[PDB]
């Protein structure tokens, strides 16, 4: 996260760290959506151009964390994966269309002050909140700049950008399964997600019922916090059909 701040304790209790078994290192962000299911970006797990293809046993999920490097005794929980599900039409060849994956944990995680699931949007919440200018929040332990790793979880609030501005900022083909967010050069403020923030959540707090909803997943960006460029996010609501199917038919 570029130009963000340190998170408050318990501010993002759905935040998950995808962690490599050997060598032990951060791979990606992720989110807790129930006691046994974790949501992330497909590219965190599968990305052939970079020879990335992880299997269940290559990985652990660490939940309830704040510190990036520290082992947070009596607070974080570490969970094994039972199974990984990647969207069958995830487009790693072109533009990361449908960049989404589900991970099922070997055993349920215990909720706590620091561990709690985020909501997934229904149609009406998505329609009300996914509007240009409305702000969401992105969290992660990724780079503080494109060249620089944080001591603790970082947070940044960013406004959704209108689809024509998103499209005109890039040569990549943008789809309905993505949205972009970030400030314009004219707007003054700045901030962005960056490498290592991948698969982490873009959340919004509904003013209707005061619950946090995950509207996006950190997916891709060209550099980080560059003027005139915007971060791109998987549109969770658009892919809800698949999420539900997987959990319905595998949970």
């Amino acid at each position: 996260i570029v130009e963000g701040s340190d998170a408050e304790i318990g501010m993002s209790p759905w935040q998950v760290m995808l962690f490599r078994k050997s060598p032990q290192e951060l791979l990606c962000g992720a989110s807790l959506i129930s006691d046994r299911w974790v949501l992330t970006a497909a590219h965190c797990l599968l990305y052939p151009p970079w020879d990335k293809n992880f299997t269940e046993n290559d990985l652990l999920v660490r939940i309830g964390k704040h510190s990036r490097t520290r082992y947070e005794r009596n607070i974080e929980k570490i969970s094994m994966l039972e199974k990984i599900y990647i969207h069958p039409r995830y487009n790693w060849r072109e533009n990361l269309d449908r960049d989404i994956a589900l991970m099922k944990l070997k055993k349920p995680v215990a909720f706590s002050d620091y561990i709690h699931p985020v909501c997934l949007p229904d149609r009406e919440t998505a329609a009300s909140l996914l509007q240009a200018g409305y702000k969401g929040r992105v969290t992660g332990w990724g780079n503080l700049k494109e060249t620089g790793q944080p001591s603790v979880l970082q947070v940044v609030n960013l406004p959704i950008v209108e689809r024509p501005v998103c499209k005109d900022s890039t040569r990549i083909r943008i789809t309905d399964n993505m949205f972009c967010a970030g400030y314009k050069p004219d707007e003054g403020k700045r901030g962005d997600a960056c490498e290592g923030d991948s698969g982490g959540p873009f959340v919004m707090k509904s003013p209707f019922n005061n619950r946090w909803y995950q509207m996006g997943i950190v997916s891709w960006g060209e550099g980080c916090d560059r003027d005139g460029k915007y971060g791109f996010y998987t549109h969770v609501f658009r892919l809800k059909k698949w999420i539900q199917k997987v959990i319905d038919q595998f949970g």
């Binding site: 032990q24 951060l26 652990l60 520290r70 082992y71 570490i78 094994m80 790793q149």
Partner: peptide
Amino acid sequence: DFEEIPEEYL
């Protein structure tokens, strides 16, 4: 740079 995790998580 990562604190080693407890051995039981593998």
